Structure formats: C-alpha cells, structure tokens
Amino acid sequence: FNVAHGLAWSYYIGYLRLILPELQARIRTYNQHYVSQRLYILLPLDCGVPDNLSMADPNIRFLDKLPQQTGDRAGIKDRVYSNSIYELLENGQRAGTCVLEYATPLQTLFAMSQYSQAGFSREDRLEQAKLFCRTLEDILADAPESQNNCRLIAYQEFSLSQEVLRHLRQE
Amino acid sequence: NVAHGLAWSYYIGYLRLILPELQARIRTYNQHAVSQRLYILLPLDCGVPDNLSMADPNIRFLDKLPQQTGDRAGIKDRVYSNSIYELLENGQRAGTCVLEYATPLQTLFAMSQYSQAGFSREDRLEQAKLFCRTLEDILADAPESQNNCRLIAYQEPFSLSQEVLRHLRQEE
Numbered sequence A: 001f002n003v004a005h006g007l008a009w010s011y012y013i014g015y016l017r018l019i020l021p022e023l024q025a026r027i028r029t030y031n032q033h034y035v036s037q038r039l040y041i042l043l044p045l046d047c048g049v050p051d052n053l054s055m056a057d058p059n060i061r062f063l064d065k066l067p068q069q070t071g072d073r074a075g076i077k078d079r080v081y082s083n084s085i086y087e088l089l090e091n092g093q094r095a096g097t098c099v100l101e102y103a104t105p106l107q108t109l110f111a112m113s114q115y116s117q118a119g120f121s122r123e124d125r126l127e128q129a130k131l132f133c134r135t136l137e138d139i140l141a142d143a144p145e146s147q148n149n150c151r152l153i154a155y156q157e158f159s160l161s162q163e164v165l166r167h168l169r170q171e
Numbered sequence B: 001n002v003a004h005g006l007a008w009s010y011y012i013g014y015l016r017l018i019l020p021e022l023q024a025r026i027r028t029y030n031q032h033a034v035s036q037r038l039y040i041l042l043p044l045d046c047g048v049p050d051n052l053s054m055a056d057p058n059i060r061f062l063d064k065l066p067q068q069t070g071d072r073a074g075i076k077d078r079v080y081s082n083s084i085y086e087l088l089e090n091g092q093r094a095g096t097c098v099l100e101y102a103t104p105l106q107t108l109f110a111m112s113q114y115s116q117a118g119f120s121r122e123d124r125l126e127q128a129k130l131f132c133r134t135l136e137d138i139l140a141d142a143p144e145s146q147n148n149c150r151l152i153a154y155q156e157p158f159s160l161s162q163e164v165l166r167h168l169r170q171e172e
C-alpha cells in the first residue's frame, strides 16, 4: 500500500497541481491558433503503459503538442512540462480530439514487479494499481486545482480509442 | 515507508533514462570542461530550493546541457533537461559539473504538509535517510549508473559549495 500511496501523491504534487491550473490557458492558446479543455489520464490496471499511444490503438493518432510549460524546480533551470494532443478515430472518421496520456507512475509499478531487489511481486502490480487510482481519485476529489479540468480513465483488459470516446460522448 | 517507492520512481523514471545518455550529452556541450558525472544533492532535512543559487551564492548557474527528449507514457517528446553549475571558492572558479537536487525529497516535504496524505512532519528526516539508503542500494547493483552519478547526502546544522567540491575534488 505504501508504494502506491506515495506514487499517487508524487503524481499530484509533482505534476497535476502544477499543470492543471495552467492547463486551461494553454489549451485556449492552441485553439486560438488552430469538454476538450480537460486532461484525460489513462489508468490501465495491468500497468501496461506503452510509450507510444498509437501502438496501443491505431485509431489514436498524435496530432500536435500543447504549448510548453516551463519552470525551475529542484535546482534545474527551465524544467519543461509538455502534453500531446491526440485524435480519436472511429470507422475512419475523426470522432474527437483531446489531451491524452498515460499515468507514468503505473509504468514505475510495472518495472518494480520486474526488478528483483524491489521485492515487488507481480501479483501486487494489480493491487497497487487499484490503490494508486483510488488514492488519486481521493486527492483530486478534494484538490482545489482540479475544477472540471481532469478526468481519469481506469480500465482493465477491446478498443482503447472507443473507451476514451465513451468518456468524451458521456458528458 | 513512502520513501521506498519514491527512490524506485526516481531511478526507474529518471536515472535509468538520462544517465546512459548523460556522458554523450556532456561530450556535445564540451565540444560545441564539465565533469562526466551527475551530482545529486540529498539534503536530509528535505529542504529543496528551486534555485540552487539561493542555496549558496558560490554555486552559479552556467548553461543548460543539450535537452533529452523521448516519447514516454503517451507524451510525445517529453523533455529531460539539466543545468550546468560553476562552483566558486574565494572568488575563484574551482570546478564545473551537472548539479541538481533530488526532487523526491521535495515531494516528501510536501506530503508532510498535506493532511490527507497521512504523512507526519516528524518522519521527514528518516524518510530522507530511507530514500538515500534505498537509492544507494539501487545504484550499487545497477550497472546503468556505472560511475555516471554520485550522491551527496548532508544534514545542515554551512557551505553547500564546499560540500560539492569535496566530492568533486576526490574524483580528480
């Protein structure tokens, strides 16, 4: 439980509380030069996190990067926070466009189950993944920086593009 | 023991990725002298300023290393950047290296402040010790960080610049 709890908090403290307040302005700026205002975070419960979303689903195609968000942190000058805009295809048709990405800490949990000295059983990978999401949901429920700007897509495995499309058309 | 996961996230998410490409990047900057190893500051009090110059006037930012980019977790060209600092001693340039704090220690400090995090503010020091000890063990058996980085663990009562120079000069 400790590992998932910490990663969820590091995900919020290190990433979400920093970019969510500035997310809306960045999205408007791209729209000015080209529900979609929300960050959609994929949470595969099996911790399978491909680095390329297109490999996960051909209907998910990279479109363009958002304007970069930079800031000095932990002695590193101009640390860059960037997000990628994806389009969702349905029967060859362009069904939507949104900022889509996986939750990277799930990728860390997968690796811990592989490395021996981590002492992390592969069975616990699913367990800590569930705890990570539930902890993340609780943080964002009371998070002030999150006001209709972040949605979590939790799933266990099918069409990944359809799953994201379901949440887009749901609201 | 929250620090155990943070040490693994620090290695898996950052160190195993940038360290293998670190020496190549340092070569590019030298041609286009900087030490070949990444120095990670580990203040055990979890005090992590964002501006290293504020921590010590003798630590002066010089220039950024060439950026490292790669698609990660669905984000195209996620940027990994590092800063090169100059270490001053009695007005003299005593060394140059890639220097940065260990960000997870900053996260440990922030966790203690949040009430729903369930992290006591008195456990900051021991979790920092646990973070260093776990990270030290990870790097000990990891060939990825084969002398491509060295940890600088310290506890303030001070000259941070002198602390780095001691490790920096030992490598000479």
Ligand SMILES: Nc1ncnc2c1ncn2[C@@H]1O[C@@H]2COP(=O)(O)O[C@@H]3[C@@H](COP(=O)(O)O[C@H]2[C@H]1F)C[C@@H](n1cnc2c(=O)nc[nH]c21)[C@@H]3O
Residues within 6 Å of the ligand: A010, A011, A013, A014, A015, A076, A079, A080, A081, A082, A103, A104, A105, A108, B009, B010, B011, B012, B013, B014, B075, B078, B079, B080, B081, B102, B103, B104, B107
């Ligand atoms: N720009 C960004 N873009 C996307 N997503 C980001 C993000 N910045 C944060 N996130 C998200 O927030 C989580 C916790 O962030 P943080 O608390 O900063 O801990 C990081 C550790 C765990 O990285 P991991 O990728 O597993 O999980 C991240 C990720 F999900 C590894 C270290 N790290 C990583 N990259 C760097 C770097 O370029 N320069 C210095 N240090 C670095 C930090 O210590």
